[PDB]
Amino acid sequence: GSPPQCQPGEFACANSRCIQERWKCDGDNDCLDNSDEAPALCHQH
Ligand SMILES: [Ca+2]
């Protein structure tokens, strides 16, 4: 119920990646697996 994901408030990519919360609703694949930009997380379009 408290996901850190890289630092205490970031993004975990299903490719297997810690990157930063910018990428969440940024609208690029960014993750390369496009985790954030599938609406399991957000998807800016
Ligand atoms: Ca993104």
From Swiss-Prot:
Compartment(s): Golgi outpost; Cytoplasm, Cytoskeleton, Microtubule organizing center
Tissue expression notes: Most abundant in liver, brain and lung.
Disulfide feature: C6-C18, C13-C31, C25-C42
Post-translational modification: Cleaved into a 85 kDa membrane-spanning subunit (LRP-85) and a 515 kDa large extracellular domain (LRP-515) that remains non-covalently associated. Gamma-secretase-dependent cleavage of LRP-85 releases the intracellular domain from the membrane.
Coiled coil regions in record: none
Domain LDL-receptor class A: 4-44
Residues where Ca(2+) 1 binds: W23, D26, D28, D30, D36, E37
Domain of life: Eukaryota
Role: Endocytic receptor involved in endocytosis and in phagocytosis of apoptotic cells. Required for early embryonic development. Involved in cellular lipid homeostasis. Involved in the plasma clearance of chylomicron remnants and activated LRPAP1 (alpha 2-macroglobulin), as well as the local metabolism of complexes between plasminogen activators and their endogenous inhibitors. Acts as an LRPAP1 alpha-2-macroglobulin receptor. Acts as TAU/MAPT receptor and controls the endocytosis of TAU/MAPT as well as its subsequent spread.
Pathological condition linked to this protein in its record: Keratosis pilaris atrophicans: A group of rare genodermatoses characterized by keratotic follicular papules, variable degrees of inflammation, and secondary atrophic scarring. Most cases are associated with an atopic diathesis and keratosis pilaris on the extensor extremities. KPA is comprised of three distinct clinical subtypes: keratosis pilaris atrophicans faciei, atrophoderma vermiculatum, and keratosis follicularis spinulosa decalvans. Affected individuals may present with features overlapping the 3 subtypes. Developmental dysplasia of the hip 3: An autosomal dominant form of congenital dysplasia of the hip, a common skeletal anomaly in which the normal seating of the femoral head in the acetabulum is disrupted. Its severity ranges from mild instability of the femoral head with slight capsular laxity, permitting minimal lateral displacement, through moderate lateral displacement of the femoral head, without loss of contact of the head with the acetabulum, up to complete dislocation of the femoral head from the acetabulum.
The protein's assembly and partners: Heterodimer of an 85-kDa membrane-bound carboxyl subunit and a non-covalently attached 515-kDa N-terminal subunit. Intracellular domain interacts with MAFB. Found in a complex with PID1/PCLI1, LRP1 and CUBNI. Interacts with SNX17, PID1/PCLI1, PDGF and CUBN. The intracellular domain interacts with SHC1, GULP1 and DAB1. Can weakly interact (via NPXY motif) with DAB2 (via PID domain); the interaction is enhanced by tyrosine phosphorylation of the NPXY motif. Interacts with MDK; promotes neuronal survival. Interacts with LRPAP1; this interaction is followed by rapid internalization.
UniProt similarity note: Belongs to the LDLR family.
The protein, known as: Prolow-density lipoprotein receptor-related protein 1
Residues of the full protein shown: 851 to 893 of 4544
